[PDB]
Structures are given as structure tokens and as C-alpha cells.
């Protein structure tokens, strides 16, 4: 259809959730409507590494350098790791073979794509199919972002 929206409340805090990926039109024409959104939640497929990851990295690069998103914070979720651990053996991460090395290399090759390091931060996470601590991570990141913005506005930071 169009844009899909969801509500959920956590720790007496209100959360608007905007799914927009189904628009299927020119992103640059309407992307500016979302200036001022507190956080951007990105999702990266790990098991789709052999190249889909080049496309995913290019898409990530574009979002960081958009002019509207100069000061917005990025929350990154790395999914499909349960299959990734087994896929390393069949397809090495070069396409020091290990789970930790591949995870660190992926994390570094993404996190090294924001020039204005001082302006914004890139929270990073590893998510599995089943985990109840994801919402706690979102809460603990959003509160930090809010505090940083309030401090920067008054000149204290």
C-alpha cells in the first residue's frame, strides 16, 4: 500500500515506528519529510554476503551523507548471524577465518563510512531470530540520543 505505522510503549515511553521501504518511487523527492526523526534503524543481512553486500554498503553510504541527516543518529542491526556462522565454512568471509574475525571486519567496514564522527554516532548490534533484549537496546540508545541533543541545544555540550 503506502507507509505502514506501528505503536509500542516501553518503560512508560511512546515509540512511533515508520516502515517506508514499500514506497517504490524516487527516494530523493520525499526523503526530506523525515528530517527530525530521533533515530534511523538500519538492517543488514549477513547470510546474504555472497555481491549483495556491496549493494547494502552503497545504500548505507548514501544515507550517512544525505544533507537532511547531518546530525541524526544511526542504530544498526546485523541480522542473519545464526546462518552466517555456518556459511563462513562453506564460503569464507574473503568472498583468519573465524566468526569473531568476520564479525569485526564487517563491523569495521560499515562503521568507517561516516565522516562527521563528532556530529553523529553509529550504535551497532548483533541480532538473532529470538532475543528479548532488543527493545532494551533501543531504549538505552534512544535515551542517550535524547540527552546528547538536549545538551547540545543549550550549549553545554
Amino acid at each position: 500500500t503506502g507507509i505502514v505505522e506501528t505503536h509500542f510503549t516501553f518503560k512508560d515511553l511512546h515509540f512511533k515506528m515508520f516502515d517506508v521501504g514499500g514506497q517504490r518511487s524516487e527516494r530523493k523527492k520525499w526523503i526530506h519529510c523525515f528530517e527530525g526523526v530521533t533515530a534511523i534503524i538500519f538492517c543488514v543481512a549477513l547470510s546474504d554476503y555472497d555481491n549483495r553486500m556491496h549493494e547494502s554498503m552503497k545504500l548505507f553510504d548514501s544515507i550517512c551523507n544525505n544533507k537532511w541527516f547531518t546530525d541524526t543518529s544511526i542504530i544498526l542491526f546485523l541480522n542473519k548471524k545464526d546462518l552466517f556462522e555456518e556459511k563462513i565454512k562453506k564460503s569464507p568471509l574473503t568472498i583468519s577465518n573465524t566468526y569473531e574475525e568476520a564479525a569485526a571486519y564487517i563491523q569495521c567496514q560499515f562503521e568507517d563510512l561516516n565522516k562527521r564522527k563528532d556530529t553523529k554516532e553509529i550504535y551497532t548490534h548483533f541480532t538473532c531470530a529470538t532475543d528479548t533484549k532488543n527493545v532494551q537496546f533501543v531504549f538505552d540508545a534512544v535515551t542517550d540520543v535524547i540527552i546528547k541533543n538536549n545538551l547540545k541545544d543549550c550549549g553545554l555540550f
Binding site: 542517550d144 540527552i147 546528547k148 545538551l151 555540550f157
Partner: peptide
């Protein structure tokens, strides 16, 4: 103390809002 950080120890001049 603030003057101590400003003058004698410029290396430890930094601010953080998480810790």
C-alpha cells in the same frame, strides 16, 4: 580543579555524556 585540567593537563581535556 577545572583550571588544573585547562592548564597543567591538556591531554585529559574531554567531555562525555554516557559515563
Amino acid at each position: 580543579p577545572k583550571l588544573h585540567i585547562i592548564l597543567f593537563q591538556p591531554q585529559k581535556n574531554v567531555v562525555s555524556h554516557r559515563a
